[PDB]
Design an enzyme around this catalytic site. Structure first.
Site, short mmCIF file in Angstrom:
data_model
loop_
_atom_site.label_atom_id
_atom_site.label_comp_id
_atom_site.label_asym_id
_atom_site.label_seq_id
_atom_site.Cartn_x
_atom_site.Cartn_y
_atom_site.Cartn_z
N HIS A 46 0.80 -1.37 -0.05
CA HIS A 46 -0.04 -0.01 0.10
C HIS A 46 0.84 1.13 0.17
CE1 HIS A 46 -3.32 2.72 0.99
NE2 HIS A 46 -2.47 3.40 1.80
N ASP A 97 -0.95 -7.18 1.92
CA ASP A 97 -0.35 -5.70 2.40
C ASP A 97 1.10 -5.92 2.59
OD1 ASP A 97 -0.10 -3.14 2.06
OD2 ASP A 97 -1.11 -2.42 3.82
N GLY A 196 1.47 7.21 8.45
CA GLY A 196 3.00 7.04 8.51
C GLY A 196 3.73 6.15 9.02
N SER A 198 2.66 2.98 8.69
CA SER A 198 2.22 1.75 7.88
C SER A 198 3.85 1.15 7.24
CB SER A 198 1.35 1.88 7.11
OG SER A 198 0.21 1.99 7.73
C1 LIG Z 1 -0.57 2.83 8.15
O1 LIG Z 1 -0.04 4.10 7.65
C2 LIG Z 1 -1.59 2.83 9.00
C3 LIG Z 1 -1.86 1.63 9.74
C4 LIG Z 1 -3.00 1.50 10.60
C5 LIG Z 1 -3.55 2.80 11.07
N1 LIG Z 1 -4.66 2.72 12.00
C6 LIG Z 1 -4.66 2.01 13.31
N2 LIG Z 1 -3.76 1.40 13.62
N3 LIG Z 1 -5.89 2.01 13.78
C7 LIG Z 1 -3.42 3.87 10.49
C8 LIG Z 1 -2.41 3.91 9.39
#
Ligand SMILES: *C(=O)c1ccc(NC(=N)N)cc1
Length: 245
Positions: A46, A97, A196, A198
Site C-alpha cells: 500500500h 499488504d 506514516g 504503515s
Molecule cells: C498505516 O499507515 C496505518 C496503519 C494503521 C492505522 N490505523 C490504526 N492502527 N488504527 C493507520 C495507518
C-alpha cells in the site's frame, strides 16, 4: 504512533525509513520497513502502489530522526521493488499488504551491521504468539489523528494481540479482517499505529527470540475504541518471501 514513547534507532535497529523523491527533487517520508537480511527490507505494498517506480525511493537504516541525518546512518537506492501481485484494497482493509525492497548503496553494497543496523528474524510458518501477548510497534507516524506533521523523533509503543474471533465481532471489523491479518490494540485503546507508521514492524518475543510477527497495515482511524490496528500476518507469507528473495 499514538501515545507510547520516543526512542532512538538503537532500540529498533532493524527499522527502515523509506522516502520518495518527488519530481523536482523534494523528498517526503512514505513508510517504515524492517531489515530481514543485509540486502532485503520488508514493508507494505500500500506504501508504493500509487508510485511503483523503484527509482523514486530512498531507504535509510540506522536513522532515529525524520528530517535530520543520524550519525552512523546508511542510505540505499532500491534495486528491486517487489509488490504482492494479489494485493487488493477496499475502503479500509488491505489484503496481501506486503512488499520487498532489495537495497543497494551508490557503492553497490547491502546493509553492514552495527550498533544501529541489525536484521530482525522472521517467524516460523503459522507460529504466532497467543492472544493477549504484548508486542511493540515502531514508526515516524502521526502522534494524533488530527496532526498535520509527523514527529521528528522515532517512536515506539506496546499493543496486545487480539484473537481472530474478537476482531471479527460486529462493532470491530466483521469480515474485513481475514486469517492472513493480526489485530492488536491497547486495553484502553490509548496507544496505536497511525498514518506514516504503515510498512513498519510489529515485533513479538517468541520462544525467547524477537520476531517480525507483523507489518503495520490498516485500521479505522487511530486509537479508536473497538478499532484495533491491523497487521499483515507475516507467519502466513513465508512462501511469498521465500520465492522472491
Ligand atoms: C498505516 O499507515 C496505518 C496503519 C494503521 C492505522 N490505523 C490504526 N492502527 N488504527 C493507520 C495507518
Amino acid at each position: 504512533i499514538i501515545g507510547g514513547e520516543f526512542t532512538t534507532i538503537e532500540n529498533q535497529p532493524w527499522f527502515a525509513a523509506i522516502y520518495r523523491r518527488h519530481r523536482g527533487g523534494s523528498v517526503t517520508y512514505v513508510c517504515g520497513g524492517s531489515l530481514i537480511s543485509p540486502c532485503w527490507v520488508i514493508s507494505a505494498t500500500h506504501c508504493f502502489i500509487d508510485y511503483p517506480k523503484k527509482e523514486d525511493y530512498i531507504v535509510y537504516l540506522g536513522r532515529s530522526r525524520l528530517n535530520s541525518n543520524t550519525q552512523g546512518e546508511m542510505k540505499f537506492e532500491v534495486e528491486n521493488l517487489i509488490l504482492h501481485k494479489d494485493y487488493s484494497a477496499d475502503t479500509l482493509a488491505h489484503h496481501n499488504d506486503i512488499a520487498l525492497l532489495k537495497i543497494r548503496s551508490k557503492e553497490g553494497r547491502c546493509a553492514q551491521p552495527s550498533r544501529t543496523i541489525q536484521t530482525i528474524a522472521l517467524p516460523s510458518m503459522y507460529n504466532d504468539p497467543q492472544f493477549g501477548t504484548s508486542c511493540e510497534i515502531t514508526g515516524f507516524g502521526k502522534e494524533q489523528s488530527t496532526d498535520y506533521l509527523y514527529p521528528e523523533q522515532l517512536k515506539m509503543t506496546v499493543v496486545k494481540l487480539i484473537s481472530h474471533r474478537e476482531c471479527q465481532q460486529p462493532h470491530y471489523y466483521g469480515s474485513e479482517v481475514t486469517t492472513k491479518m493480526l489485530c492488536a490494540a491497547d486495553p484502553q485503546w490509548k496507544t496505536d499505529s497511525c498514518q506514516g507508521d504503515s510498512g513498519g514492524p510489529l515485533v513479538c518475543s517468541l520462544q525467547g527470540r524477537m520476531t517480525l510477527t507483523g507489518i503495520v497495515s490498516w485500521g479505522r482511524g487511530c486509537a479508536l475504541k473497538d478499532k484495533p490496528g491491523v497487521y499483515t500476518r507475516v507467519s502466513h507469507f513465508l512462501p511469498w518471501i521465500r520465492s522472491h528473495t
